[PDB]
């Protein structure tokens, strides 16, 4: 069964604010920089994956340009990497250079931001969706007592309410940077607490942070991988109107969620 060993696939790579990984001006010279840019069909956003762990556009290979963090990610001649182990993409969408452990990062959100190799902190700005479908995925999010997450208090808070099909504030847009956004206001992201004294999950202006990176795991949790915790209904009591970040526990169903899209 050779379908088990596909030799290549050409796709796109989207990330922060739903922008795409783009070879700037489609330049082919070694060290030509990779940027963040609005997603389209152009060849310089077409990335081909191969079993040698290379990722390629315009015939050349995505690559870090330094051992230390802070420098641009570039495309360069693939023969320069013949003895390199290449890239490793985690199950959560972190794209990592195997040797250096540097991670594809977008330090700003605006079109033309240079992508760089950075130390991994599991920020939303270090989360990517490899795939051709780059749009935010619109969904409801079902939790304890078959209830739906709703954006509340002028899109500042979030808790469970009974699912109502029409109700616009129960819809969420799932972005390529692992953010969960208010569907009607896509500058607003579900956020773990910035106040040390509180575990309360809230809604705040999207800023690319660890607080806003979320992973829908196959075991049915909503994980914040940088804080090694999951979304949880406080006291397994939906009436408390509080969702919190907790370490994974088999004790309650408050950590179980469903994506209904």
């Amino acid at each position: 069964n050779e379908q088990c060993s596909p030799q290549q696939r050409t796709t796109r790579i989207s990330g922060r604010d739903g922008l795409c990984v783009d070879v700037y001006g489609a330049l082919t010279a070694d060290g030509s920089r990779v940027i963040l840019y609005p997603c389209g069909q152009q060849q310089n956003q077409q990335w081909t994956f191969y079993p040698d762990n290379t990722i390629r556009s315009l015939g050349k290979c995505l690559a870090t340009s330094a051992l230390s963090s802070g420098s641009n990610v570039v495309i360069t001649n693939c023969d320069y990497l013949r003895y390199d182990d290449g890239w490793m993409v985690s199950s959560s969408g972190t794209m990592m250079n195997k040797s250096s452990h540097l991670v594809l990062t977008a330090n700003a959100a605006t079109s033309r931001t240079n992508l760089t190799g950075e130390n991994n902190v599991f920020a939303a700005k270090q989360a990517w969706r490899i795939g051709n479908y780059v749009e935010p995925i619109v969904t409801t999010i079902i939790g304890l007592r078959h209830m739906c997450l709703e954006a509340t208090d002028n899109d500042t808070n979030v808790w469970l309410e009974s699912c109502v099909k029409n109700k616009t504030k129960q819809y969420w847009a799932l972005y390529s940077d692992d953010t969960i956004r208010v569907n009607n206001n896509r500058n607003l992201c579900v956020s773990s607490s910035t106040d040390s004294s509180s575990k309360l999950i809230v809604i705040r202006r999207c800023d690319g942070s660890i607080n806003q990176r979320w992973v829908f795991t196959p075991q049915g949790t909503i994980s914040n991988p940088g804080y090694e915790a999951v979304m949880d209904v406080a006291q397994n009591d939906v009436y408390l109107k509080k969702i919190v970040l907790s370490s994974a526990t088999d004790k309650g169903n408050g950590q179980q969620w469903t994506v209904f899209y």
């Binding site: 994956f49 993409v89 199950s91 795939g131 469903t258």
Partner: protein, 247 residues
């Protein structure tokens, strides 16, 4: 035997049943990068079947044999009778329901086969609590007019729900809202592609989680979403287990 009764069919009990069905199917499952259990394969025929009891609104009970390799129905029992799909493994009748009057159904356990024989499609076959109930009845008495649509109902509400949290949730919505439904493109595209998603996910191991082919999954707005990798929550948080496909 794991069981579900129309008498006690609340969103909670339905959910527990599906959760336990998945649990049991995935005993001894293998795992890849994606973290989605891959069902067992090359199982000795004596171990290949999981039995599940379904009871309708009036204490009529059937027992379904599920093949643990593919989460499909091979056969079922009603009282001292049993019924085997034509494509059930040929040795199955020596292993399950041995002390019954065994019979062969003249169609396969696939949607394509069941749809042709019954003259009706999943898109026109309602799902919900009352349809579950009546389906159990028609299987119990083996009324041949209704056997194919009864299987469309029960395969979708039991097995396909076990495969996909999306489908499980469609049934929960149906219980909570007290409203039957017909499956739309979203549900059907999952059902249609379970096998292909299985293959691609396993094959993706050698391409950093990227698929060899794209699979189209529809959302509730009938928009198609191309899934050409494991980095789609609508796959990775939905498909609860896979068919074994790759070494």
């Amino acid at each position: 035997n794991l069981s579900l009764s129309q008498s006690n069919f609340s969103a909670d009990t339905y959910k527990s049943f599906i959760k336990n069905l998945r649990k049991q199917l995935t005993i001894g499952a293998s795992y890849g990068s994606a973290g989605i259990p891959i069902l067992k394969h090359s199982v000795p025929i004596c171990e290949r079947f999981l039995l599940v009891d379904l009871t309708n609104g009036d204490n009529e009970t059937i027992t379904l044999a599920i093949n643990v390799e593919d989460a499909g129905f091979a056969a079922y029992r009603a009282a001292d009778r049993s019924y085997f799909f034509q494509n059930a493994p040929p040795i199955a009748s020596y292993v399950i329901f041995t002390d019954t009057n065994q019979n062969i159904m003249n169609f396969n356990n696939t949607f394509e086969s069941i749809e042709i024989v019954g003259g009706t499609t999943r898109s026109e076959t309602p799902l919900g609590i009352m349809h579950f109930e009546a389906s159990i009845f028609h299987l119990f008495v083996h009324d041949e007019n209704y056997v194919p649509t009864s299987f469309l109902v029960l395969i979708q509400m039991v097995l396909e729900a076990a495969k996909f949290k999306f489908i499980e949730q469609k049934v929960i919505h149906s219980i909570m809202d007290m409203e039957d439904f017909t499956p739309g493109l979203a549900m059907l595209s999952l059902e249609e592609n379970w096998t292909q998603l299985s293959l691609q996910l396993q094959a993706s191991e050698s391409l950093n989680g990227v698929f060899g082919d794209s699979v189209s999954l529809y959302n509730s707005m009938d928009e198609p979403i191309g899934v050409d990798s494991m980095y789609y929550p609508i796959l990775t948080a939905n498909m609860a287990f896979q068919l074994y496909q790759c070494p």
